[PDB]
Design a protein around this ligand. Structure first.
Ligand SMILES: Cc1cc2nc3c(=O)[nH]c(=O)nc-3n(C[C@H](O)[C@H](O)[C@H](O)COP(=O)(O)OP(=O)(O)OC[C@H]3O[C@@H](n4cnc5c(N)ncnc54)[C@H](O)[C@@H]3O)c2cc1C
Length: 391
């Protein structure tokens, strides 16, 4: 079989790229290791930047989002017995963020693709990439037990943190930047109404806590935990008790608790590779970079990588300007590093780090006091949170 663009991975990045390309008339095939069900079981993201929202509209998949998504104009940070609201809309010059689950976004994309008739191969096992620096690269995979070959012009590596694509680039060509944090987030999804109409990020001596939501009757909570913790050691009641201990009394008092629909621990880390391409292979999303969840940027950065790749692929196919593809990495990395810096900052000021001295603890507290009390300081948080413009 042959196609124009082979896409490895049917997560948000691959699906969104596939939809945009299909609409523009560029044939593409998506190869996914897992089943549609497994992919749909991943909870993950809840916060979307306006840029991503606009990209979903451009891809023609925003009906349900426009209907069910919750537009947020502010967010709160709680620390040292204070609750500060950052008016995102006012301080960012009118921008806002939208709360709509990643599960929902993926479901919408999957249905759109399904309907268009575009090719998607689930349970594509043993994916291998070949002749990346040739004029004719190809992908091999096994379906049932037979090895099939897919010829194409370009390959988009949208296979996430553990994908094969990044591993297919000669190690000596890539420079890696990584930072592993000494804690993870224990998340809990409950069919309960959220404690607040806006998100609450809390810095507490016991550790970080976050109050988020999916809708008016579905909530998502997180608490910072050591990497040595096992989700089996955390019953629902232990979670609720701990959550309450980290929130302001007035907030903890209004909390409606309930059995969890999903519980899991996500370790925190930063990871960037340079460049993000090799020959005819281009990396996008988590395959190229990981950001801690604190700044709500992961999926959002996948969106800008995809928007950039789609636009450059259009110029190459439609305008015959293939040389522009060499600019992919430079363009993406400018936005990536800025979102990485923001996510790193948010993580450092909101969490409790082990073995930090008195001086560091006071500086952490003063960072919050300063940034949440100065108009210029609040503006730096707001413009970064709603999302820096796409280039
Ligand atoms: C707890 C948590 C909270 C988060 N909150 C937010 C948020 O609020 N906002 C935000 O912007 N981001 C958030 N993120 C990040 C966001 O979820 C990710 O950045 C997003 O999932 C990345 O999408 P992707 O498509 O690049 O990769 P993934 O979702 O990982 O999809 C990659 C796909 O490729 C497939 N694949 C892998 N290997 C192969 C292979 N060898 N062959 C073929 N297929 C393969 C995988 O099965 C998978 O389906 C959060 C993440 C976590 C963990």
């Amino acid at each position: 079989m042959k196609t124009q663009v082979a896409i490895i991975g049917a997560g948000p990045s691959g699906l969104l790229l596939g939809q945009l390309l299909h609409k523009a008339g560029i044939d593409n095939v998506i190869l996914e290791r897992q089943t549609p069900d497994y992919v749909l079981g991943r909870i993950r993201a809840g916060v979307l930047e306006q840029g991503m929202v606009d990209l979903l509209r451009e891809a023609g998949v925003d009906r349900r989002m426009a209907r069910d998504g919750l537009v947020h104009e502010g967010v709160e940070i709680a620390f040292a017995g204070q609750r500060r609201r950052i008016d995102l809309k006012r301080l960012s010059g009118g921008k806002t963020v939208t709360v709509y689950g990643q599960t929902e976004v993926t479901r919408d994309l999957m249905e759109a693709r399904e309907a268009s008739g575009a090719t998607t191969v689930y349970q594509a096992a043993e994916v291998r990439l070949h002749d990346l620096q040739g004029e004719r690269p190809y992908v091999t995979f096994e379906r049932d037990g037979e090895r099939l070959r897919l010829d194409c012009d370009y390959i988009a590596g949208c296979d996430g943190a553990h994908g094969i694509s990044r591993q297919s680039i000669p190690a000596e060509r890539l420079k890696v930047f990584e930072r592993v944090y000494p804690f993870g987030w224990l998340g809990l999804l409950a069919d309960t109404p959220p404690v607040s109409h806006e998100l609450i990020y809390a810095n507490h001596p016991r550790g970080f806590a976050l109050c988020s939501q999916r809708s008016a009757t579905r909530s998502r909570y997180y608490v910072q935990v050591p990497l040595t913790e096992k989700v089996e050691d955390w019953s629902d009641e232990r979670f609720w008790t701990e959550l309450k201990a980290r929130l302001p009394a007035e907030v903890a008092e209004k909390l409606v608790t309930g059995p969890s629909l999903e519980k899991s621990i996500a370790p925190l880390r930063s990871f960037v590779v340079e460049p993000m391409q090799h020959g005819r292979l281009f990396l996008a999303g988590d395959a190229a970079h990981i950001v801690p969840p604190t700044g709500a940027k992961g999926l959002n950065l996948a969106a800008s990588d995809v928007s950039t790749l789609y636009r450059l692929l259009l110029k190459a196919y439609r305008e015959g300007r293939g040389e522009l593809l060499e600019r992919y990495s430079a363009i993406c990395l400018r936005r990536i590093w800025k979102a990485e810096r923001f996510s790193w900052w948010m993580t450092s000021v909101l969490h409790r780090f082990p073995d930090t001295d008195a001086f560091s603890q006071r500086i952490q507290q003063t960072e919050l006091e300063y940034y949440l009390g100065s108009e210029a300081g609040l503006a730096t948080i707001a413009e970064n949170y709603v999302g820096l413009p796409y280039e």
